[PDB]
Amino acid sequence: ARRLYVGNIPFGITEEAMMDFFNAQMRLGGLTQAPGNPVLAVQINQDKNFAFLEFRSVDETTQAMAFDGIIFQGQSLKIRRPHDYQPLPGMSENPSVYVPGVVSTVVPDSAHKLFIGGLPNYLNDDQVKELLTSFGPLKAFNLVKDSATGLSKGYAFCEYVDINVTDQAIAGLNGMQLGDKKLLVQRASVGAKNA
């Protein structure tokens, strides 16, 4: 895929200012495979609050994914792959089925994103992040705000650099009393319990 989905983009951001930023991130990081800018175009859906990046190569696109969660103009960008990948109802389940095509040779130690809820609606990114930082530096953090309203929805996602600290972060934060709400913290995917 020579395309990437980038949501939670800054308001009023221009397509060109989205391009110049990514191309300048690809160069600073040295993630380019050949001379020239990787990002050829960017399309922004202002109302929907998202944009799509268009790369010249497939590998470069797969390299820009490392910028998921990067801070740009106070907004933590959400980078994902397009959804042109459909279930494809062609019938005769053989190249699909379920397992065939994605058996997974062996998933590496990854995915330790944490879900945080019960957060007061008045706290902002720099306040919430602080409460989380008290256990160690974060590698990715995003506070969900209403599309129109713009205020906190009451829950945010975060991931530390040192995953082990992830477990320590849940045991000390989960249940914490914030205002008139009870904080909730659990692995955003699997791991809401501890054996």
Next chain:
RNA sequence: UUUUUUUUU
């Protein structure tokens, strides 16, 4: 407001 608005402008 306890799981984060994906398209060929």
